[PDB]
From a paper:
Hence, spy49_0662 was expressed with a 1.4 kDa C-terminal V5 epitope tag used for Western blotting followed by a His6-tag for immobilized metal ion affinity purification, and the resulting protein was coined as HupZ (heme utilization protein Z). The tagged HupZ is a small-sized protein previously shown to bind heme, and it exhibits a trace heme degrading activity in the presence of NADPH and cytochrome P450 reductase (CPR). This protein shares some protein sequence similarity to the members of the IsdG family. In summary, a comprehensive biochemical, spectroscopic, and structural characterization led us to propose that the observed heme binding in HupZ is through its His6-tag in a sandwiched di-heme complex from two subunits with an oxygen-derived bridging ligand.
Next, HupZ was crystallized in the primitive orthorhombic space group of P212121, and the structure was refined to 1.7-Å resolution with one dimer in an asymmetric unit. In this new structure, six and seven additional C-terminal residues are present in Chains A and B, respectively, compared to the previous structure. The C-terminal region, including the His6-tag, still misses density for 39–40 residues. Comparing the structure of H111A to the wild-type structure, the two superimpose well with an r.m.s.d value of 0.99 Å over 237 Cα carbons, indicating site-directed mutagenesis did not induce an undesired global structural perturbation. His111, as shown in Figure 7, is located on the protein surface in the homodimeric structure. The ligand-free HupZ eluted at 18.0 mL, corresponding to a molecular weight of 36 kDa when compared to the calibration curve using the known molecular standards on the same column under the same separation conditions. The molecular weight of monomeric HupZ is 18.5 kDa, and thus it eluted as a dimer. In all experiments, the higher-order oligomeric states were observed only when heme was present, indicating that heme binding to HupZ induces oligomerization, resulting in higher-order structures. Our results indicate that each subunit of HupZ binds heme in a 1:1 ratio. Collectively, the rR data coupled with the UV–vis study indicated that the heme in the binary complex is in a six-coordinate, low-spin ferric state with at least one histidine as an axial ligand.
Numbering used by the authors:
A (entry chain B): 1 to 126
B (entry chain A): 1 to 125
The structure:
Amino acid sequence: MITQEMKDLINNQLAMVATVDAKGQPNIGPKRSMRLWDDKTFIYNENTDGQTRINIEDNGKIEIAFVDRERLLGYRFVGTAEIQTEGAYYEAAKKWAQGRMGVPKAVGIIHVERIFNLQSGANAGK
Amino acid sequence: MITQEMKDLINNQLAMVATVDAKGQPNIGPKRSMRLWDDKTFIYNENTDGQTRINIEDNGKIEIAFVDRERLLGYRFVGTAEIQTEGAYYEAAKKWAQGRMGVPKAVGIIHVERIFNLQSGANAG
């Protein structure tokens, strides 16, 4: 679902993540550890329990955008998120962090459901 | 309440804008025209009838972020927003657009309530 063209941009740009709290306030922030798990899934290392973790545990809603500012290209990924503290995703996030950052409090997992282009704005699911 | 360092980042980086629709779904998109108006206000040129505009019109809630791709630097600005199609901001937005982009459909105005230093600073004001 995530194409090699998309992967290239993902691996060259910063993940910008939007979530929402209970009262409907959007929250935005970069996730510099955001990376692909497979062709339909992102993971990131959750180290702080900031608002993003709270929002995901509340309602699971999320959007991730990557933009190539220079070439005016990008992608928006829409899906469901969860937080895990045990299991395969978490242990992988733990190993990835070793020698790199602190031991993760949790791992965030994003299940991609729809993909949109960020020049056009059109659904790029084919 | 705006640092010169903040102004530098804002001028050199792309605003990413988060809003929410009437059903509570988040939306994120870039707005290259997002720019500081004064120390408590951003504006951007709205050239579309897209989701960011729809969401601002619905509930006014917004957060914007400017982040350096290559360095651990950036700022988050949280506040409320409105869309205008007439008045002084809109006239200013039209003048700004010439030689930069198309004639705007509207102007978005963001009233800053809180500032966050993103990767190294927590709150900044």
